[PDB]
Amino acid sequence: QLSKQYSSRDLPSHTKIKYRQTTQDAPEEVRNRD
Amino acid sequence: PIMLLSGHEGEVYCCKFHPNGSTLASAGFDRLILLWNVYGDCDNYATLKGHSGAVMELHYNTDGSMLFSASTDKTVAVWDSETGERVKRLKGHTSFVNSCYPARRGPQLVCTGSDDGTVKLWDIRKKAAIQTFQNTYQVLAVTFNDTSDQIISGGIDNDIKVWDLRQNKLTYTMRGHADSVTGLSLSSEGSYLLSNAMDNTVRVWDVRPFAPKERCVKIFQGNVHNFEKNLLRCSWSPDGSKIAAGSADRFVYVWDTTSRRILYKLPGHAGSINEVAFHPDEPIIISASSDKRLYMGEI
Amino acid sequence: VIRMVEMQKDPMEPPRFKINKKIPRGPPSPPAPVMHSPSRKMTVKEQQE
Amino acid sequence: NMLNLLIHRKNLNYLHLDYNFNLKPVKTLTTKERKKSRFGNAFHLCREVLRLTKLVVDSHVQYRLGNVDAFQLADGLQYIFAHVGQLTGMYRYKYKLMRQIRMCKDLKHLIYYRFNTGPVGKGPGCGFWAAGWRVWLFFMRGITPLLERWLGNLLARQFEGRHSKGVAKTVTKQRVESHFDLELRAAVMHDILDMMPEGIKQNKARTILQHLSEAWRCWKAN
Amino acid sequence: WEDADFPILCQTCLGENPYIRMTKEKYGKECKICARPFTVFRWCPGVRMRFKKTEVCQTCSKLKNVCQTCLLDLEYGLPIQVRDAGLSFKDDMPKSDVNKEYYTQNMEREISNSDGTRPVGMLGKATSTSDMLLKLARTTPYYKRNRPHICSFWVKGECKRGEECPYRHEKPTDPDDPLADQNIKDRYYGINDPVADKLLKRASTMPRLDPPEDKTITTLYVGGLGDTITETDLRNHFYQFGEIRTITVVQRQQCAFIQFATRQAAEVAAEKSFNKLIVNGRRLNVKWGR
Amino acid sequence: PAHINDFMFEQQRRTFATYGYALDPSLDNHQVSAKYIGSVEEAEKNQGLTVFETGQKKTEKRKKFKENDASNIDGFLGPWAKYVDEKDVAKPSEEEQKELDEITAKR
RNA sequence: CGGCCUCCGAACGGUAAGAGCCUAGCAUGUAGAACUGGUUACCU
RNA sequence: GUGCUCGCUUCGGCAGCACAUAUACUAAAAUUGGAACGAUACAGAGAAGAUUAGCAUGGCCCCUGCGCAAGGAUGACACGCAAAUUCGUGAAGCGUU
Ligand SMILES: O=P(O)(O)O[C@H]1[C@@H](OP(=O)(O)O)[C@@H](OP(=O)(O)O)[C@@H](OP(=O)(O)O)[C@@H](OP(=O)(O)O)[C@H]1OP(=O)(O)O
Ligand SMILES: [Mg+2]
Ligand SMILES: [Mg+2]
């Protein structure tokens, strides 16, 4: 029982996840750090 | 492991090993020839192209240096496993060429069985025909004799036929199969030859200088046919120990040369198994089935 | 042996059925056993408190 | 036909949409029908777009029947595109239109004041309708996904039904205080009247909440 | 919404050819009982037979254990009321709107936790097929079900479509007959379905062995014995069923007379054997002797 | 979940449809033989002929018309040529007609 | 050698809310439909 | 039905080959049932003395709206024992072991 209604706010948006880059604080560095 | 391979869009009719035991070739309805590496993860490196019809039979040379592949589109093809590229398009066949066989350890020579009513002998270098024994009708499988001087063929009239390359007459005709023969494969003995036929019986014969004049040796039960009448193919093991067969019953049939017992009717498939391939080195089995994929069983 | 083929959907066709039906919610799952520690006593004075 | 099928499916027999896409009642309607028969901006935006196209295709039909002329058709089309404000009444329902409307004025002041640079006069016969046409085509490029969404929602709601079960409406500006008090007294009820009890029998939490409200009024009264 | 792999249908209704071609439509229609949307599968039964369609949810099927279009039971194949009575079942599925939608919701939630293998509930606890059920069962496929309807035109004369008249251009059945008006809802709920009553009267008029008056008449006459039977064979027919006290194998009349040790044992044996004790292919007639 | 070949399934189905017998499809783990199921004796006497395979049939084809000159204004029957051995009206007659009136009254 | 020229219109919040009532519409276009008739004999 | 058989073989047919390969919720119906916020008439509006603004909570209540916005009498509805596990003193009188 799936509706075909819809919403202005369920349009696609921010469809890519940012990942924490090499210098910002990647889980590798924090794995290292003291 | 079971190691099921996929990546083929339609039925795979033919699967066989490198005679090295290094690389895998499979082919079928999709009109192209896929290659894989047998070891590791059973991975796919290359794909050969060009054949307009269905690849009905692929065949190696005995070193593994050039590839023969019989196509539905009236043609055979020899290609370079070195490159994958065509060296020769054996045209001239007047109908569906289903079966191909390169001469082993002799001069480079090919026998092709076709749906025209002829068996054709060809030399690769001349781009011309050598000999052709028009018996009456379609020939469905063809294999040489280890002297490269007789040629064996099996078709619709159930009497397995053998021609002498020098007198060019019906040398040896053998009888006893109740319906059409679908597959021949001569063991590495150079002597014992295996015949599948959809009448549900498989037979063993032996081409020698002297045979008992009625050389129907061993007989096994189990193979099936149905409304499909797909082409069913058999093989010996590298050792002449186990016979492997497929059938339209989804069961890989593994029997023995010795006790003719049913060593296996293995399930696992979804569609008819058309070709089973034995590893020239290992106890490795590869099943090509009409369910659009392959299996890599280890025994 | 039967041949399944899925019937085409008409692009210009509105939904067919009424979705919004209300009913009370089902019974939950079988109640789990209450594994407590034994109760202690409240004197009259505490209940006064 | 589509808009009439909509009107008559909702069971609104007292209204009818006439052939220039005007919506008119054929009775005087009581409150219940003045309410039941209100329509939205989807319906009306579709109505007004269809009215613009009917104006255009009917100018072309007049040309083809023999009634007008090539020049009268061209200038009448230019007219249509310049004056969408006074012919349709679209701006009522998506007021952003005035972007477009002001644009088709600016163009007309250009073209006109370059059309009539010489003996040519201030009269009607100026139909160079490329510019306004372009403008309304770009407007339509923008509006079609919007209207397809709005009309999909309307049709769904009309054929499935509106979902009043798990609406879960946000907390906006009229519900800030009532919601603060909802959550404050939910918190208080969690807080002690069930987690510092041992007034076992019936912990009277409905009466501690009365004390809470009265303590607040007493704070406010000092 | 339901979602299935195939219909679940009677062999009668599935057709004659081994090779059938069938179409699926996802969320295609509304179960006439479950009231919710289902997937609807449509197949051509045979040459010149109407296309049939699955007409009840897969859950509404698994619950009462019937064929999604034929509506008859799955093993025996009688109307739902007949099968219920023969299994002595009491099916408590609600009737009113709200109660029925609620019951359907929870029954579906609980059938979600199944294996998809056998009906849920008493339809497993009532599979003891009584000889009445086996006796009423259909034997070969009554494939008259799949022929087309009656041509209103060709009943009035009008079916000017030549031979292609979309309905069997035969005589319309007299509407007075009880076997005419059987609404789907009742035939699923089993409340006053005429075919059920006619079949039940037929099962009541069917031959079963009669009981005697006196308790002391503990000799049971089996007629039609034949001389391929042994006294030990008549024993094995009436030996472990209780105890037999004596056996007279009358060869001058090809019959037998079994004196038992327990009245209920012999009664169960002979009634359960009535015309159907088929040992070495002989129709013996089990009755109480004089 | 089978995967079979396509020309062959339709071949067997049309066979069973127009001829009444067919190569039975059971792929049993007990090796059965090719048995013509359905009208077995029909398969025997007809030599297994398929509706797709050409075969000798002296069967009288129903008589049809043929007006394929497309210049006659009301002439061209072309592909829409009726069968000549066809009826010109379709109706039920005096007894069944009154009986159907009686039934429609009874209903 | 100087040029500078905003805006602009519609809805809701006023015209109570309700049970019955009865008849169009509007939906359905189906599923199913039937089967018989077996009987006694020996010693006081 | 089209063409070709070096087919009979005339130019009549017959044959052979090739080419061409399975539409369809079968209905002009016939059914069968429920709504129009329409009449009809009843009916008839929270809080506190009076007159009135509203924002909520609950759910087998909806309606208008694209709406997760807003509106619908604060949209309607929401109150007669809203009593639940469970007692014992103190005295008297009467009859009893
Ligand atoms: O009615 P509008 O949208 O404002 O357009 C008109 C019109 O244009 P049409 O010819 O398309 O009706 C006039 O054009 P002419 O009178 O020049 O032929 C005229 O423009 P003019 O000023 O150039 O006369 C007039 O303007 P106004 O009322 O100031 O005279 C005005 O255009 P505006 O947008 O210029 O008002
Ligand atoms: Mg108000
Ligand atoms: Mg008040």
Ligand SMILES: [Mg+2]
């Ligand atoms: Mg509100």
Ligand SMILES: [Mg+2]
């Ligand atoms: Mg107010």
Ligand SMILES: [Mg+2]
């Ligand atoms: Mg409210």
